[PDB]
Symmetry: D2
Subunit: 476 residues, 4 copies
């Protein structure tokens, strides 16, 4: 079973006024599975009016009641994990097992943020005149416009949504048209748990028309976007033209520094498993594997065997560990990346081709002998491709790791305290994981530097983009 998806406006699942829809396809087969409403300006207007009202209601609900309502929604998400996972796999491609992991980690996210909303603390400042009380109070910024991508349909919504609700803002999101049902189910849990009419809204349609209307509108006080660097720059540019608060999680290009002293088997297992997660369609996916020359050959061979062990297929079939890529553009993007690697003299150690003629299946691929000018070492591939290059000195791996304008995630494998410390200071990334894969828990900051954007989506720092800070000084 796969369901058609509607807009959520003012507590009501509704069609667009025009009645227009967009078709949704299963990327494992290319076959239509359902449809989603395509919003016009008139539905956005109704959504903006409701977000204004929702904001006025939700800001007045004490943090401990907001928190309990969020926790109920999380319990519902958790109760419905199987059904939501099933929707997600059909629209997006990832294996059922990975979809369930994402839905459960959404529940965990909502819960931590629920509790953090109760710890949005002001402060009292020792005063220069004891007749006066000097305070700093924190309040919600106002209605949020959010724009989220298809690669983790639920999780890319839930951090933003959980942050907005915990601070007491209202929230209007344009979820992905290619993966609409799983996020709509996430929103439905919040409605079912008691979040009032107007506090949350959900639209789909033409992304550029929606973001062009929403971002400049006087109801919206904060914009949040997760996506590509080039669309991020257009949106941050418009947000600045209209003096809106904005945060952005954009491309990454994660380096992986496997040092001379690394546990090599651990590196292959950790960084290899993390590469093929969601078929590499992850903003923090390990991409540029910088491997000390003493162990490069051993690493490369073991990474190749890891890729060869993956079972490619429809994400509903058990045994599947690597599903369809999410859409046909991702297939074309992979061929372009592979063609360019071969042209510039790199070696395809395994994979490198489409599998079959139906759906978006690409083989897990490992590329070695990669020169610095290959597309795979410069543009974010966002697909099931690891690129390996050797180095002799740790300092040259670190310079390579910082060479690109991306800087989101970084990985390393090493045993010495001095190398940890050096990597910690020197690597230009938002997030660094050593001797393990990415474990991006809600309590941990999650955000970029440079072209990867700005603003955190974890920790207490995740509430700051949704808050205004007010200095209040009262003389008795």
């Amino acid at each position: 079973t796969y369901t058609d998806t509607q807009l959520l406006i003012d507590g009501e699942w509704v069609d667009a006024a025009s009645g227009k829809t967009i078709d949704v396809v299963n990327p494992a087969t290319g076959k239509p599975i359902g449809r989603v409403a395509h919003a016009g300006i008139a539905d956005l207007d109704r959504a903006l009016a409701a977000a204004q009202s929702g904001f006025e209601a939700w800001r007045k609900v004490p943090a401990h009641e907001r928190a309990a309502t969020m926790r109920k929604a999380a319990a519902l998400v958790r109760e419905r994990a199987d059904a939501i996972a099933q929707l997600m796999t059909q629209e997006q491609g990832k294996p059922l097992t990975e979809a369930r992991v994402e839905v459960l980690s959404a529940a965990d996210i909502i819960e931590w943020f629920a509790d953090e909303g109760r710890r949005v603390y002001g402060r009292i400042v020792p005063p220069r005149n004891l007749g006066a009380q000097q305070t700093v109070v924190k309040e919600p910024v106002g209605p949020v416009a959010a724009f989220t991508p298809w690669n983790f349909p639920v999780n890319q919504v839930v951090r933003k949504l959980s942050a907005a609700l915990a601070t007491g803002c209202s929230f209007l999101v344009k979820a992905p048209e290619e993966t609409p049902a799983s996020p709509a189910a996430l929103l439905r849990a919040f409605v079912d748990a008691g979040v009032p009419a107007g506090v949350i809204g959900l639209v789909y349609g033409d992304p550029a028309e929606i973001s062009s209307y929403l971002i400049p509108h006087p109801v919206i006080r904060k914009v949040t976007f997760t996506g590509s660097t080039p669309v991020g720059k257009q949106l941050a540019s418009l947000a600045g033209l209209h003096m809106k608060r904005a945060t952005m999680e954009l491309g990454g290009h994660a380096p992986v520094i496997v040092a001379e002293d690394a546990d090599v088997a651990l590196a292959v297992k950790a960084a290899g498993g993390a590469k093929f997660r969601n078929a590499g369609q992850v903003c923090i996916s390990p991409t540029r594997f910088l491997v000390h020359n003493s162990i490069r050959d051993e690493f490369t061979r073991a990474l190749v065997k890891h890729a060869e062990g993956l079972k490619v297929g429809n994400g509903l079939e058990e045994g599947t560990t690597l599903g369809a890529l999410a859409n046909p553009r991702r297939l074309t993007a992979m061929a372009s990346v592979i063609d360019n690697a071969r042209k510039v003299g790199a070696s395809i150690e395994t994979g490198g081709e489409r599998i079959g003629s139906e759906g978006n299946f690409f083989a897990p691929t490992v590329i070695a002998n990669v020169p610095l000018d290959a597309d795979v070492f410069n543009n974010e591939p966002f697909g099931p491709v690891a690129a390996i290059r050797g180095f002799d000195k740790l300092e040259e791996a670190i310079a390579e790791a910082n060479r690109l304008p991306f800087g989101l995630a970084g990985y390393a494998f090493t045993r010495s305290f001095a190398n940890v410390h050096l990597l910690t200071q020197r690597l230009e990334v938002g997030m660094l994981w050593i001797n393990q894969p990415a474990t991006p828990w809600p309590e941990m900051p999650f955000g970029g530097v440079k072209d990867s954007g700005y603003g955190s989506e974890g920790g207490p720092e995740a509430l700051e983009p949704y808050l205004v800070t007010k200095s209040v000084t009262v003389m008795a």
Copy 2:
């Protein structure tokens, strides 16, 4: 005695490569008093190269050394405050007494920030696996491009500068061409204190050309602007287009709520004093006086008396209490404001005219019976004009206070806990002062919401726009 001004590039005071200069005029006379170097692109390229290596040097100086160096700069600023104040008064117009208070408080600000840099703390998070250490590390974002205006030539540079230096960033500021000598004496204190070559740079010239070149440049990792709403929109847009971190301190339109239970004498002395500070040329200048009908007329007469007691004249005369406006565009703007007020049926209770035919002298002015559609009640006057309206109910005054897209400062006068609490929760401002004038100590956040911008320039919060936050997890 007034001094020509040069660029500060790589530890040296230098002319522009071209030899071009711009004339500086005394706004009390219209007469040339000196000139400032006019940078072109070649000078900016040298400033940027120096800023890069400066960032690389300064980020390695431990915090406690950076603090001690900053405190040395502060002590020199304190000692030279009267000679710096004489420069400021000549180029900008404010009375000497105000200029001294500005410069002495610059020293106070440097000291607080020097100490704050020793408290940029990371976090250790209780881990999900006890075999890993999860930390949150803070580090300087990089070279900063700062753009500052003429109203507080020193003070608008000093918080930005101190924040940059306390975090380990390097700093390149374009200070105002019409008030260049006093900001250059501020940077000189720092050079004399031992801030190394390239860590600070100062340039002057064509604002648009410089900002268009600096903001997109790869060296600049962060932008900070203080000035008008419409210019900040243009710059935050450019900054968005090149994915640069940006803070913005923009227009205000500060309401004053004088409640039924207010002490009227206090309200006039506090808010009337604050209105005519630097001739209203202040982003936090009280502008819209909303006075409870029971005391509207009594307040209006007392504010009229306050304004008629100011002594208008050259700021170098020590008894001068209202100097010349900073520049001729400010006279033009006061004429338009008063003209519209008269045309919409408001009453000019005092002032309303230029004084003399030389310099930029405008009389301190009070406007009563002001309709909500008057320019003075919608656009930021930025000059020595107060606008008075009545109200019956506190909640009508709060709604008027929140009508405008501006939201920087607010003031109120009241004695009940209930009113204090209400004004605290409901007024859409970044800073609220109750029963006293503005006291923006460095330890207190200072920043806007809505069209007034974003980012704070006081408190620990002042450092965050200059920091990047990095999640580090290391499995042992």
Copy 3:
């Protein structure tokens, strides 16, 4: 139904090795209702060995798993609220309605602390040498010995227990022999939710023998006591002799300052309702009512009518709003207080006598015209007695409020911001509530100054007594 109570040692409900028990009485009738095991030194030894083991296990369980186990126990407490309330009312005396409130607020407490255990943050300090990492880590102190009283049998356990478990300490408590079943049910929820063997223990017996053995024993690293000031001083003295960490919540003697501008009806309702809560057997119960002379007579008369409206009786019978006092000593203590008031010239405005000849029923009592040397104005009465005295100047009410060595809770009623501010600065109390009764939520600090003891039992400060702080500096 009322059940006999056993010791909890190493995951097992067990009898004492001697087989000794103590009888439990219903204070509403004087009739035996059950019994509780009476521990000897040999059972304590087995308890201390298990706490050592429990500490070694529980310290290794990640904060997010500890947190989920605590939340389950809270859900169980909440599921069993009726059954636990019933036990409590029979052993302790309070009305069923109030017992249910306490059990539910216990669940709320456990939950907030569960979440706070995940936010025991270390920090990273900017280093004096960048080659070195300077960190501050937080770890559990070790096994706790706790000693809790009969007045809120569950709540006096739950803050201490929740704090210890959230930090990762083990916990051994000696609960009250006169009210053992309700706390034992609280502990049983934690066993049922999965807290491992040894992490929690529960003993009863002779309090002085237990605290004399536990406090000096090398397994115990932290002592916590809630009780009387004189027993607190003996226990803190012994804890210091053995260099143990100790916190103490001791007597209060709460002032209530009803100022000239008070809402009088609000004062009677808030402070009057709070006085007769748990029949005044509360460490923060409003006791010394300092009332401005203009409204003293009106206040006194309305407080008298509030007391006269209470329905005294068995706590299981519906309609009951004031139950039996908890034990016969409390009845004797009340007569002594009333006899002394009459002897020193005060007036008994209502109540003042035992009701009936069975059980521990005392009438709700209001005393006026109280001189400063009455026992009720010096010793903590801990019973259903309010004592009223007038004042003319707010400064003399404040001096009276600070006259005694107690300082736990304080109350006031006033409308002006200046009075709030003055009271906030000047009143020597741990907790001050204005214009409302006590709402001691888990997120709020709860602790004394002076003879009322030290250490907080709310907020993040509640974890600090259960934590050690370790500076770690590692040179690369």
Copy 4:
């Protein structure tokens, strides 16, 4: 040149009312060099009355003024450091170079704490009812009684003093009778800087009589002791009996773990240097050297060489690197320690004897082959003796490090992240230094666990024992 010492009471240097004095002797010669006033009860009563009104004055001085005054004191301490150091060396014995470093670092400590007092922040908590403001306010606890020992006559006073003054407390210290002039010059700097009359007081006499009188006295709200474990037990017991807040910094017995992968030359230079600092008369002096068997013998020989290179002599000679021990009871104690070591079969590798027959000179000593039952491996030697033992496995060394009831400082030498992480989580100490000697900067917490005491004397945590925390909730 050495100066007799007086009491500091109410802004005046005075004799005891009685005229009694105590002789002060130079420990390098046994010869009188001056005398110190010997307070009786009447002097203490005047000190306490002054401390009370001092507390009332100082708590009203805004933080920023208190800071500026403290910084002035710091500057005077810096300027006078060499004259203060000459006093210290004569009365206490340490080399002049060490005495200068102690006094210069006292100035650094005052400065950090002065700034920290401006950051004693309260909290605003998100309320359960939006009509109330819930705040957490911090305020000084009250007059402090401080008791300090002879080992760092200045430095043991300065953190306590600075913490007291930064929070708004008044401070009355009993400094050591055997080293009285240098602490009195520290208090003089503060008097000269403008700390008002009564805010500080200094007394000398009979330690027991003074502590027995001060600790129970109603004026004293807080006690702080640094000294021996057995004396601190006696004082923390007395403090408990009168319900006074207490902090305690007591004995240490610092392990040094030299791991298999350690740099031996670094370990000897860092830990060997630290052992013979102030002749081992330091609560954090490395004592139990636990060295991996592969390098035990090499470490032992190198430490022997380090010790034989010290230059023993009068501390006034600038080339002296090990001075006389502070007092004759310290010789007696070194003789007992060495004697027991010999009797239990340990080997004296170097030193082991008194040098000369005048003064308190004891040779730098290294003991190897030390059994676990030797006095030197159980009791704090507090003198110039290192005790060496081997180990095979890191976890046996950790268990030995944790065997003793002491837990102040620890040291280790190792290069692997795994070992660093393990030592961090498992070593029962308050401070751990890895690959370097002790660097206890004021910004870092400094305090023990178990028998070494409680309370921190660095970091923000240093202020908490001098603060009370007050929950304030005000319903509007």
